[PDB]
From Swiss-Prot, chain A:
The modification Phosphoserine is found at S8, S11. It comes from the Eukaryota. The chain holds residues 98 to 126 of 180 of the full protein. This is Glucagon-like peptide 1(7-36). It comes from Homo sapiens.
From Swiss-Prot, chain B:
The chain holds residues 29 to 128 of 463 of the full protein. The lineage of its organism: Eukaryota, Metazoa, Chordata, Craniata, Vertebrata. It comes from Homo sapiens. This is Glucagon-like peptide 1 receptor. Belongs to the G-protein coupled receptor 2 family. Disulfide bonds join C18-C43, C34-C76, C57-C98. Glycans are attached at N35, N54, N87. N-glycosylation enhances cell surface expression and lengthens receptor half-life by preventing degradation in the ER. Residues 1-100 are extracellular. G-protein coupled receptor for glucagon-like peptide 1 (GLP-1). Ligand binding triggers activation of a signaling cascade that leads to the activation of adenylyl cyclase and increased intracellular cAMP levels. Plays a role in regulating insulin secretion in response to GLP-1. Changing E100Q: No effect on stimulation of cAMP accumulation in response to GLP-1. May form homodimers and heterodimers with GIPR. It is found in: Cell membrane. Changing R93A: Strongly decreased stimulation of cAMP accumulation in response to GLP-1.
């Protein structure tokens, strides 16, 4: 039951990261 | 769980709305105001000379609902130029209230 310790957490983290890297790309220039 | 595609669509809409506003809003009272601009991240209005300018966290951020009170800051110099970061022409900005 440990949060962040399951494959579903890793897959959700990877998808969230796609959007966050887009944000970081916009912030840079 | 907010996806890249959802975020791109919101960003495009934020940009579209910003660009309409930049086009539509009446000109500043003097050329000493810093120019409104969309910097790829946030939509900035004209700035009074010698003043800080703030706008809300851009609403397309995946974590926007977690920063509903935050603002991002620029500084408009007395000459009508946005303050720049040293050894560059990038604008100074404080985005810390809108981080995840």
């Amino acid at each position: 039951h440990x949060e962040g310790x399951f494959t579903s957490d890793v897959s959700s983290y990877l998808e969230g990261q796609a959007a966050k890297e887009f944000i970081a790309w916009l912030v840079k220039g | 769980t907010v996806s890249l595609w959802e975020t791109v669509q919101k960003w495009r809409e934020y940009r579209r709305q910003c660009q309409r506003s930049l086009t539509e809003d009446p000109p500043p009272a003097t050329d000493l105001f810093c120019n409104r601009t969309f910097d790829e991240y946030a939509c900035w209005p004209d700035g009074e000379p010698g003043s800080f300018v703030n706008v809300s966290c851009p609403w397309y951020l995946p974590w926007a609902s977690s920063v509903p009170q935050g603002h991002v800051y620029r500084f408009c110099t007395a000459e009508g130029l946005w303050l720049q970061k040293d050894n560059s022409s990038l604008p100074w900005r404080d985005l810390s209230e809108c981080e995840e």
